[PDB]
Design an enzyme around this catalytic site. Sequence first.
Site, mmCIF file in Angstrom:
data_model
loop_
_atom_site.group_PDB
_atom_site.id
_atom_site.type_symbol
_atom_site.label_atom_id
_atom_site.label_comp_id
_atom_site.label_asym_id
_atom_site.label_seq_id
_atom_site.Cartn_x
_atom_site.Cartn_y
_atom_site.Cartn_z
ATOM 1 N NE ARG A 207 -3.631 1.239 1.651
ATOM 2 C CZ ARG A 207 -4.326 2.079 2.409
ATOM 3 N NH1 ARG A 207 -4.829 1.683 3.578
ATOM 4 N NH2 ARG A 207 -4.509 3.325 1.999
ATOM 5 C CG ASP A 232 -3.650 1.818 7.921
ATOM 6 O OD1 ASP A 232 -3.244 1.597 6.760
ATOM 7 O OD2 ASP A 232 -4.569 2.628 8.167
ATOM 8 C CD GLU A 503 -3.599 10.253 3.908
ATOM 9 O OE1 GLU A 503 -3.266 9.184 4.472
ATOM 10 O OE2 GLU A 503 -4.522 10.318 3.068
ATOM 11 N NE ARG A 519 -8.296 10.900 4.122
ATOM 12 C CZ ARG A 519 -7.947 9.672 4.488
ATOM 13 N NH1 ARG A 519 -6.773 9.165 4.096
ATOM 14 N NH2 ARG A 519 -8.770 8.955 5.241
ATOM 15 N NE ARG A 581 -9.807 5.890 0.861
ATOM 16 C CZ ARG A 581 -8.991 5.709 1.893
ATOM 17 N NH1 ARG A 581 -8.314 4.572 2.027
ATOM 18 N NH2 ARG A 581 -8.859 6.667 2.806
ATOM 19 C CE1 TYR A 615 -5.173 6.553 1.472
ATOM 20 C CE2 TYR A 615 -2.877 7.000 2.003
ATOM 21 C CZ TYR A 615 -4.214 6.964 2.372
ATOM 22 O OH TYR A 615 -4.611 7.344 3.633
#
Length: 658
Positions: A207, A232, A503, A519, A581, A615
């Site tokens: 990622r 994460d 971000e 963001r 997303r 992302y």
Amino acid sequence: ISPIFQGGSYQLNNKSIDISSLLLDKLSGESQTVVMKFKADKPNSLQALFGLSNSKAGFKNNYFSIFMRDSGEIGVEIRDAQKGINYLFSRPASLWGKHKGQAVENTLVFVSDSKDKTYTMYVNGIEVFSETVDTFLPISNINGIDKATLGAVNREGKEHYLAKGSIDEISLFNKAISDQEVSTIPLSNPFQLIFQSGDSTQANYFRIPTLYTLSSGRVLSSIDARYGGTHDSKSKINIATSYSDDNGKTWSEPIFAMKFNDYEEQLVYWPRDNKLKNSQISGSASFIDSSIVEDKKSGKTILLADVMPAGIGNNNANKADSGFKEINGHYYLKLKKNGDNDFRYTVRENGVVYNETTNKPTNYTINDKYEVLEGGKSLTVEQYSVDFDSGSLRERHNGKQVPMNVFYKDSLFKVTPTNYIAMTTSQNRGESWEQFKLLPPFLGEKHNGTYLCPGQGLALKSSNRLIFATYTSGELTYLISDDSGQTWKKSSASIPFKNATAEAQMVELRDGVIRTFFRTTTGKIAYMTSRDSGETWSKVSYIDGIQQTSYGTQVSAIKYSQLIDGKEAVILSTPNSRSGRKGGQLVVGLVNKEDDSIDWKYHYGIDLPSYGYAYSAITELPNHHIGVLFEKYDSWSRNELHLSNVVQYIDLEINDLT
Ligand SMILES: O=S(=O)(O)[C@]1(CNC2CCCCC2)C[C@@H](O)[C@@H](O)C1
């Protein structure tokens, strides 16, 4: 071997095609392979590409199907009511729809192997699932099969799951071809993989892509190599890098820019079921969210990333402690020794471990690798490995000794359980990386580190100034170096959100003028401007014409080197969707020199509005093409966790965007 059936150019226009007479009597034995080259750029919500069924009244649940969803999910059903079997195997985000506005030919290979009792699906050269079952159901052993269908499943004489698309080629074999044979099937992929399962990182997941174009013409990429699924931190994650010397056509085998060794680098197929999918490696140290800049003066490449001690992620990091002690204007890393319940030690000059209670140096030192030495002798700890052999995640010692590091669970001396930022440098443009060094705290003793904004840092054109954006509660915190990364200072810019994952990525619009895109929590991308090379920052404005979800997604941004329609141009990469997303776009904005305002004039669709896009990294390649490395899946969705080989690279030309 040779196909038992082969056909092509089938148009699927919401009307099934019957191939019963051609195929059904050719099927024999318990193992089969289906190879299908197909397009679907306007799919229905749920549609069957291929079907074998009992079409008789009373047997609506006796069929095999290869199906897809308009989310890009691919799957199969294998059902026989008499046997009491109803298998459903699938993986989200497995398909391409369009590339450069033209329908993509997907190459699907489905292997039904009676010998290992396993069903395996590949799409576009990527294995998307491998499912072993207790009781195997050969696809032609379904009770009373009497139809073979393209573009639907025939149930009780009616067309179910009608498809829109085309099957350019389809072949069936009475054999389960080997993984080796699968790899020899020709592909027509619109994308490349830079990082991938089974490469040198040994991570099964990735990622947080980055891209950055170096002065030599080399293009460099960094990424989270994520071992414990796509979770994460807390997890095990290293930062890996790869470069291209031919404008992105080929990439080097990855190496690590930052790595811990408290846990083994294991390639693991992380569970995706609803009981186990949240299983998370909980005792490993990790790195997460990398960012790259090149320093013209020194020639160095600089990479920063967040660092997390064992068991720590952004959710449980101590927000009220920097992990450093201020002593007479200097910051020293604090340490807690096993047995103590407070942090009685500091790491002073020359790595000497100092006892704060008695003000005496101890017999311990910390080397440049944050490893613990006692009287100059290296201490070790036992490495852990992880497995699901017991039916749940187990983390246990594996017999191997590794250097004792203060970020580790088993270390005699441990750092504060909070988040840090580290930097490494390369003197050879990514061929090797130095041992990382922690950055100092920027917001005082009693504040956790800020969070690095993944992607690119910014090297100002007319000075030696280097800037990396970071975020924390209530502000963007820019880290600024004018001495090739040796020292840093912060410049704080307030934003009107609390606890936003802000971000941020930057472009230099003209000398000394920086625009930052970031963001938010509002569904719109925000921006702010500095006109003094990052010293001070304007209030926040919002971009219209792009939609994000309430939680938001990282946005990447570059200033293009060439004029477009006679104007300077900024390109943004982001999903454009209020749902998830998905719907990735590059958006081209033309700068008005009078007021530095931007007219967002062109929106390029990366793939279908319904297909995943999270992302992303964008960079102008030396030949003025645009490279894009992006998460082609919804990295937020709890249904799309732990997918392999979905971070993908494409090459675009400016004319494609406009
Ligand atoms: O102008 S830079 O900031 O040094 C940079 C590179 N410019 C070259 C100029 C010549 C064509 C390729 C891109 C843009 C950023 O997006 C990074 O890729 C670094």
